[PDB]
Design an enzyme around this catalytic site. Structure first.
Site, short mmCIF file in Angstrom:
data_model
loop_
_atom_site.label_atom_id
_atom_site.label_comp_id
_atom_site.label_asym_id
_atom_site.label_seq_id
_atom_site.Cartn_x
_atom_site.Cartn_y
_atom_site.Cartn_z
N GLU A 197 0.81 -1.20 0.00
CA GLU A 197 0.00 0.00 0.00
C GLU A 197 0.84 1.25 0.00
O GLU A 197 1.84 1.26 0.71
CB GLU A 197 -0.85 -0.09 1.30
CG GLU A 197 -1.71 1.13 1.50
CD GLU A 197 -2.38 1.13 2.87
OE1 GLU A 197 -2.50 0.09 3.58
OE2 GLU A 197 -2.73 2.31 3.16
N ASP A 199 0.52 5.21 0.76
CA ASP A 199 -0.30 6.36 1.20
C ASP A 199 0.37 7.63 0.75
O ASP A 199 1.43 8.00 1.27
CB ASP A 199 -0.52 6.38 2.71
CG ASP A 199 -1.14 5.11 3.19
OD1 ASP A 199 -1.97 4.44 2.56
OD2 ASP A 199 -0.87 4.59 4.27
N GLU A 202 -2.38 11.41 3.50
CA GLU A 202 -3.20 11.11 4.69
C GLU A 202 -3.13 12.40 5.50
O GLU A 202 -2.03 12.90 5.81
CB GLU A 202 -2.70 9.86 5.35
CG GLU A 202 -3.02 8.63 4.48
CD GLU A 202 -3.21 7.48 5.42
OE1 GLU A 202 -2.12 6.95 5.76
OE2 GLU A 202 -4.39 7.31 5.76
N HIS A 213 3.92 1.37 2.52
CA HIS A 213 3.75 0.19 3.30
C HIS A 213 3.91 -1.04 2.38
O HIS A 213 2.97 -1.58 1.85
CB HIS A 213 2.43 0.04 4.01
CG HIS A 213 1.89 1.14 4.86
ND1 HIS A 213 1.66 0.99 6.21
CD2 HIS A 213 1.50 2.42 4.55
CE1 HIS A 213 1.14 2.12 6.68
NE2 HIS A 213 1.03 2.99 5.71
#
Ligand SMILES: *[C@@H]1O[C@H](CO)[C@@H](O)[C@H](O)[C@H]1NC(C)=O
Ligand SMILES: *[C@@H]1O[C@H](CO)[C@@H](O)[C@H](O)[C@H]1NC(C)=O
Length: 400
Positions: A197, A199, A202, A213
């Site tokens: 993942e 991001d 955020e 991640h």
């Protein structure tokens, strides 16, 4: 589950593909709401399972029964509106609440044919978007990120998988949560649903965060036992970048005293630099507001290398230990080279009030103002607008 026969009316979103030589070209994409937002119900009205659990055992003893008993409802444009999702030109407006119902939408970017997710290959490329953060107070999270979801929503893994990308199936992320459906089939074994993942964004108007991640398993993997935990296959914490954590507390925030003023629109440009063998080696970020380039600030604490971008050395020095164990920046880069799905969402959190994002070292929020019950007293209708999404060569998606 099995989609009913209602007509799906996906909101349209125009996005851009750019190259240094011929600029940005506009194209047509579609937005689809998560499968779970559509409404998955039995014939008698009972649900098929709640987030965190295996699907209803009476309804779903086995995969084939679950497909026949759990009905997914198509969403027409009014259903999209009422779920907090509307678009206009190149703008995507997400609202947390509709008539005081928590809708907290999460949506994915579909290809123009609507049958497949638009797969972004980011290693070695640039990604830009404009955003409007003023209506997101402490405790809110307006997120733009990528997951390594299956392009067809999991239809190819099983004859019982019917929804596909067209109805928003196949979601996964690095927390390996247990959801009632996995790849469009009932999650009978109760596996956590994992995948690499990235991001990109955020944030709320008080603080912003970046975090790759990596997971050691490619694509969507259903974990069991310790595979789903902190010593498992995916990095829950990620390798983070939040200017407040590296002691540059006037970089981003509400008003003219900040380098990047979150009460007004601004452009976010992210560049994923690759070495000569094609591996991802660094993640850079810069901002454009009022026609000026605003460069990220260099780390301002003792310890990490004195740089303004993410790399393996910055991650090891700031304690991202699971990130390094699972392969670090190269591993994230592999997922990003195979292709990932773009996800946009708005949410809050009753359990920790988004503390990790905007409290203490992470920002200026006290410990209770991010409580969902206090957020509405500051902003009765929290929302975020993402727009002008441009994907292309380094140096081509934004300018001054
Ligand atoms: C499980 O499904 C059965 C059969 O429809 C239904 O009667 C029951 O209400 C469901 N339980 C829950 C908690 O949804
Ligand atoms: C944070 O910034 C100040 C300068 O603004 C610096 O002197 C201070 O030591 C920094 N704190 C840490 C813990 O690095």
């Amino acid at each position: 589950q099995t989609p009913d026969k209602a007509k799906e009316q996906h909101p349209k979103l125009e996005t851009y593909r750019c190259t240094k030589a011929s600029g940005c070209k506009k194209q047509t994409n579609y937005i689809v709401a998560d499968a779970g937002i559509h409404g998955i119900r039995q014939k008698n009205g009972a649900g098929c399972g709640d987030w965190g659990q295996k699907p209803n055992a009476t309804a779903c003893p086995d995969e084939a029964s679950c497909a026949k008993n759990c009905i997914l409802s198509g969403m027409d444009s009014n259903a999209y509106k009422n779920a907090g999702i509307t678009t206009s030109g190149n703008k995507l407006r997400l609202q947390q609440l509709i008539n005081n119902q928590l809708v907290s939408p999460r949506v994915y970017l579909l290809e123009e044919n609507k049958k497949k997710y638009e797969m972004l290959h980011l290693t070695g490329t640039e990604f830009s978007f404009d955003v409007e953060m003023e209506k997101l107070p402490c405790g809110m999270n307006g997120a733009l990120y990528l997951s390594e979801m299956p392009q067809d929503g999991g239809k190819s893994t099983s004859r019982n998988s019917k929804a596909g990308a067209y109805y928003g199936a196949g979601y996964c992320d690095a927390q390996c949560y247990v959801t009632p459906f996995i790849n469009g089939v009932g999650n009978i074994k109760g596996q956590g649903v994992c995948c690499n993942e990235l991001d990109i964004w955020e944030a709320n108007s008080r603080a912003t965060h970046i975090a790759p991640h990596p997971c050691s398993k490619p694509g969507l993997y259903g974990c069991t036992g310790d595979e789903c935990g902190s010593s498992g296959i995916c990095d829950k914490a990620g390798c983070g970048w939040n200017h407040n954590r590296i002691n540059v507390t006037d970089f981003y925030g509400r008003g003219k005293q900040y380098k990047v003023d979150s009460t007004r629109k601004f452009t976010v440009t992210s560049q994923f630099v690759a070495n000569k063998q094609g591996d991802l080696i660094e993640l850079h970020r810069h901002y454009i507001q009022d026609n000026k380039v605003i460069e990220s600030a260099v780390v301002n604490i003792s310890g990490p290398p004195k740089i303004n971008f993410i790399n393996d050395k910055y991650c090891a020095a700031t304690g991202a230990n699971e990130y390094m164990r699972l392969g670090g920046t190269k591993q994230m880069g592999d997922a990003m080279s195979r292709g990932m799905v773009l996800a946009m969402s708005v949410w809050w959190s009753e359990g920790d009030f988004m503390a990790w994002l905007d409290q203490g070292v992470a920002g200026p929020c006290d410990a209770t103002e991010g409580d969902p019950k206090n957020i509405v007293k500051v902003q009765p209708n929290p929302e975020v607008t993402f727009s002008n999404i441009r994907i292309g060569e380094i140096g081509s998606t934004s300018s001054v």
